[PDB]
Ligand binder design. Sequence first.
Ligand SMILES: [Cl-]
Ligand SMILES: [Cl-]
Ligand SMILES: [Cl-]
Ligand SMILES: [Cl-]
Lengths: 908, 905
Amino acid sequence: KGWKFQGEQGEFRLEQPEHNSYLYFPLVNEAGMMSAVTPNLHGEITSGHNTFLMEPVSAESLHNSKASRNFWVFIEGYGAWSVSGNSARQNAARFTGEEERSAVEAGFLWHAVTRENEKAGLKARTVSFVPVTDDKIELMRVTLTNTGNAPLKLTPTAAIPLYGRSADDLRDHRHVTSLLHRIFTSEYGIEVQPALSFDERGHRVNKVTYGVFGAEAGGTAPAGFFPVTEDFIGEGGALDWPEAVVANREPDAQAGTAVEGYEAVGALRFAPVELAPGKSVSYVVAMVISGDRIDVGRYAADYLAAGRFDALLEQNRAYWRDKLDTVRFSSGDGEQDLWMKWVTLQPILRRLYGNSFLPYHDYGRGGRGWRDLWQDCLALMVMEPAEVRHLLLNNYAGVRMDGSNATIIGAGPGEFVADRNNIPRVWMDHGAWPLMTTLLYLHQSGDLDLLFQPQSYFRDVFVKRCRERDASWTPEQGNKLLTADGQIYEGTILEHILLQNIVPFFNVGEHGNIKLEGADWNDGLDLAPERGESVAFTAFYASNLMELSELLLELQKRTGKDSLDIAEEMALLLDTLGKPISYDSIQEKRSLLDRYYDAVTPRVSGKKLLLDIRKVAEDLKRKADWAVAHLRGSEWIQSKEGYAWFNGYYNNDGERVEGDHPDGVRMTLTGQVFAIMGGVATDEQTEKISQAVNRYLKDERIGYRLNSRFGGIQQNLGRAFGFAFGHKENGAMFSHMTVMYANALYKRGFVQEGFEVLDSIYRLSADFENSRIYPGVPEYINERGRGMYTYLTGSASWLLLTQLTEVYGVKGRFGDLRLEPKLVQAQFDGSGEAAVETLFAGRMLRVVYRNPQAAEHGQYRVDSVSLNGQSVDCQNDGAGCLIGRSLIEALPADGVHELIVTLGRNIS
Amino acid sequence: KGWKFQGEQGEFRLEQPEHNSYLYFPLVNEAGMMSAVTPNLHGEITSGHNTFLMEPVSAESLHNSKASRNFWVFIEGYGAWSVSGNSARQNAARFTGEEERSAVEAGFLWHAVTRENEKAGLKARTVSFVPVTDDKIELMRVTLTNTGNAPLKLTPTAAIPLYGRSADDLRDHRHVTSLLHRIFTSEYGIEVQPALSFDERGHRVNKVTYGVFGAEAGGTAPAGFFPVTEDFIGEGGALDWPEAVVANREPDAQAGTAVEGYEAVGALRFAPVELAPGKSVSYVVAMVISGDRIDVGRYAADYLAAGRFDALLEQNRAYWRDKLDTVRFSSGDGEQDLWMKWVTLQPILRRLYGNSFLPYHDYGRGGRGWRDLWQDCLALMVMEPAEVRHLLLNNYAGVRMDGSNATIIGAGPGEFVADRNNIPRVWMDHGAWPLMTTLLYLHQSGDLDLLFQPQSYFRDVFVKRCRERDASWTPEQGNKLLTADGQIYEGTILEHILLQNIVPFFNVGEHGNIKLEGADWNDGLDLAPERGESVAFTAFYASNLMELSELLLELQKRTGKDSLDIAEEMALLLDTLGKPISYDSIQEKRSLLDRYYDAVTPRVSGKKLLLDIRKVAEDLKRKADWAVAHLRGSEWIQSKEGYAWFNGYYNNDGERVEGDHPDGVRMTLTGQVFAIMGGVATDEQTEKISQAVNRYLKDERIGYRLNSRFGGIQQNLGRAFGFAFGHKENGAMFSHMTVMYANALYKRGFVQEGFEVLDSIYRLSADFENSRIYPGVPEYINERGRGMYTYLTGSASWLLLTQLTEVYGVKGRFGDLRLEPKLVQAQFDGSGEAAVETLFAGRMLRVVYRNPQAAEHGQYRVDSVSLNGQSVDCQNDGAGCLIGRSLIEALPADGVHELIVTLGR
Ligand SMILES: [Cl-]
Ligand SMILES: [Cl-]
Ligand SMILES: [Cl-]
Ligand SMILES: [Cl-]
């Protein structure tokens, strides 16, 4: 019943594709055309929240709305027929065993729908893609073929239903705003340019223009048009059975006609044609969004002229092949290797959609959040590392002097927007992710000097981590932290990082773990700001502080830096250097944090202290050691049944969330992941955690759940518990957290367990009968096994990163290349090999692991390593081998350089 | 081919009704169930913005969404079939000449869709109505009849697609919010009660429950259910072709099943049945919204038991017949008389829908605006007068001490909400409508003492007609104007009225007419707050001031009141009493108004002056005379062609809006109406205005336009000009203003002209081929002749009122009954009669005008008047005859009392 890969480049085919609800496929470009296309050509087309070409949709629209893209043929002796099956007549064959043969084929990045009218002897194939040009444009090519024994007489009509305004107008002033429409017909099609826009921006003049144009393959313009939706469908008609097509009416309008005040359709009537047996005719349709009236002449020459569609499709295929060839996996599981190419696409899709504008993602307006700033750097480090350094530098401008950060991202490089009107949430984990991302950069690049670049701090009306409003703020101060004498304060990137991690350490709740604030990574743990605690992310901050300590000593060891320049007020938080407070006292830690807040609000002095890098490291290690001992001694729990794991949470009544409970044990995956990843969990505790996970969270049908079932809503904890169990942030297999769990297991050497987790995600995703999704990893697998919120999920970045840097084990260590395979025997192919092609230190490498002895992980070691046909010496034997960055950089820039790692068995 | 009336109570029928786009019919009750139903059973069902049972829709949804109410029959030998024609199979017959025979019949207040499957020998009839009980409920009865020669085997499935949450979720978090759904099945159907609500109110616990229940005619419960929409439609299915029906699957769920996290459908599978030739089976479906989980047992007993649908439908018919029988017209145009019964319904509909929740009305959230507070009193004064006095008193609490008013209406009696976050618009005409409404009340009731009742004034952060923010404001001031000593200030209703009308007099622009502010009645004249002027409403205020003057002298003449108690600071604005300023000086009028504003901001002193009622009247007449002379002398314009009329507007560049212009003369209807109505236009000017209207605004196809064509957007005037010409506030036949034009013409004795106007509205509305609406008056007739924004339009209140008080001429004069017919000869029936049944001074009267000499208007007069078979004396010959209120009040309370007015030459 499912899709099947064809060829070796990731192309797939699915038979009878409209027999599955809710399917859609993405077409997008950098210019900003963002489309979704279903098996009957429904979906949406937009350049932003305020500029939808086709009507904004959600999931239920995909079956319930008749307004798909469409292309009609009026077939002599048969009548009206949709090339995608979206007509009332064709839809009425569903569930009667009389459905027409159909298929979807797709690739990088294009989509093809096929259909056969056996009765009439007609076949159609409709190819959709977004060209890789600088226009906001989607193209469609319909090819019709006479498969029968006699000539067919056909009258074609393209029909792209238009919306042409803000999603704010979907219902609210939907009809009123239709009165603002202005339609202009020209030789090749229809433009709609509303006179005004009425939406949440207010009432303004509009110039944005939405166009539908078309031509025959040979360049011939349409014979005429039906630009007005109500006239096209006819009195009592609809877009899946429109009178103009069904009664084969003469066109309403020719070129040069203007019509005002009506909903519009890009309905293009082509000349009738006699199609000989075995012959084809094709039509090209272009859907365009532009900032002003369209130069229809240029668009016709560029997109509709004979041969342009085909040339541009080849350009699309080459551009996407080039983007995705930066990472290629090769293993014994060829299907998973191909599925991984789709995973590899997803991080790009998230960037170019702004996590929005696909049917399930029905609320996004295309912006970026704080998390995205750091997360987007993960795939880029592997696939396109040139801009990573600049992004990281810019991102740190968003940090406040209390360690919190701006939460609305602006247009410009390192631009952040203050909202003085809405009191914003603080997410307690926002300070943890930046160091994780930045450390990866440091280890891939070797660019330790990034840490000493200067950067400003964000400043707005909100102080003491949004606990109060500063009465002294003005528009005249601007959005940057100021010194006493009025200058923009600048500190090192490292100063920003230290602040982000040290502040949460002191911001403890009544049970001594770091406060939940408005939520952590689970945005649905939003109802415990007063007394909630994220033990889960206390582990992450503990680990961050420890890594920082190690980082600083390594900076001294490598850079020779003996000193750190830090704002003088931050010396209060590095209490180990002066008069140390008791970290066992919640009162003392909170009081100290209050003194710090007072010292830096509204302004800093601008004086900096130069502090011994070892002494700062020592302070960070004291904090980290304290947190580790506290978590192990106070937050390690056990059920009566005998399983044990880490409590992740305290609720808004100050109660421990996890453990035994009426109606079942309560456990969270999030409470385990960072404990494992960061080392708070001992090896023994990690083994025990994995047993508890497998007992309480691992579902036989849907895999590793985010949490076990809490009965009913949990109004002292979060809105997540209002979702049905097994959906979204309540107990679904939430891919992002599950992948991080696997990553954590691989990091700690629990390779078979890690493998099981990663393999479960793939198996679930690829089990089409239940998942009902195309190749890729979804945001979650739900209670019924369905894949939900496709393509845009951050889990793809983590899956890609984990497969590369943990499973195949190709990763940087201070700029040097560390190779440490964690492949299991089953992953090696019929030639005893598994390989990855990957970019490192500006060179493309094919890292090939040879396991001729077919040893399991734990039974093998690196016997020898060769590069470009020559022996490489390595500065390690245990763990894995380490190759100096110079040897990579010395390779030629052109071509793929093969690096062969031969694996042999262990002695004794 | 249009609708046709059947019988004499306003019931109509339309053949092949789904052959027309966008049709819908309203079903509503006082309890708050608000529904729309189309010929294929689409539309919507809601109790408010946040509590939609069926998905929120606009006009395009009515064809584009498959999620109609539906009822399916799986017919052995034929397969799946929709009783309303909404299946993929049946829709595919449209435009092929193979469509099934169908009809809509409707009445007060119910709807019936019929359909025939000729192939199978099956007929269906589906009746929808909202019971007039205290529940928020819609009922549906489907009756199936075997019209063939052999038994039919039928499997029925009701299917009401559910939404069950806020319109805010239509797309935004549509899917996320589906995860909050909780579905519960019981013996008689399906309940959906979301665990939480996520909408513009925030994230909250929800208890509201949406139910779909059903039974066979005899009370037998459904055999089972398909509560989950995706399971009902099946993989790749849709609501117009759902697998559960099409493949005739066994039910997914029985009573006692709970399902969480999925969009829901009220899909009720009834037991299969063998239907004999000629025989019928019926099913009843109930759609319910409740504040908490539904007592399904009680609903089954009350709504699903054998015979309850029929009893409740009869109760519905009797309730609505009783509401609408308060006004009945009878003339030579029987069809118009019946169409007027639908017009008579509309003011009730506007109240019970809150001008919202019908497909075209896709933005209203069910509240009331300032205008509604006064406008709603119009229909109530003639249909249901008991609460009118209380409403009027409460409404005046919303006036600020600068004559402006609150624009957000609250929950409680005379509750008004401060806006606070948005700097709000001031609508310059908001102060004019209250006196108009109140004067009508005074003349219908005789209750002159209303004018002396005390009332507070509204107070918020906005002062000087929202030109500045009060620096002294806090939450601790509260929502009411305070005295110097800290007391809530109270002034008479008359004080409020005087203020509302005197302030605009001084608030003049650079050309000397009253400032446009954020708009007048045309809400789309919103882009000239700095320099715009509404000459149009300057005429209305001029007339109001003159009527006030007359009112005060009449108060003295009747009440014996020699004094008016008025806040001392308002004496500044009655400058005729002290040191008069020059009304010819814009500077002096504005300066004086500034001194007044300063005197009452932030507080009044609380001291009142007693002022001679004649002297106040004299001040008001001076103002009114000044305004009249200024408008006649400065705003009367003429085109080069020789037509002449009143300029209505100055734009934000201080330019005169109307007159000759490149690409065509610019004229507004609004600039004429109040000039005529209020007397600013002389009789000569009124004749000339009517010629100019007919020349520039009267379209042969669509009737009296609101304005002539201004080419392109007009960003120094208003957003209205961004609408396509002939739509909404840009040049459509906008019924409300056109009716007021007619009213104005009748008032001034231009009866043939008035008749033409009113008759055009009817003809346009009833020309179904173009209008494509059911009986009633629409908000506008558009460029293509289509009726738009049906049912809820305030034009119905004006049409009703004008037909009663001007055309038939049955109106109050200080509580006495004045009869002054303005019927044309063609309006009299074959017996030479035209009549109106109407409620006056608490009695139902049938006023019959007999015109045996067939005289035209202007050629006839009142020869004699008789009441219940006895001669009535009249205290008037000129204008019309006047009957003392006592003679009416002395009549018996039960029954309709006939009052025969014989007309001679
Ligand atoms: Cl067929
Ligand atoms: Cl956003
Ligand atoms: Cl058929
Ligand atoms: Cl509202």
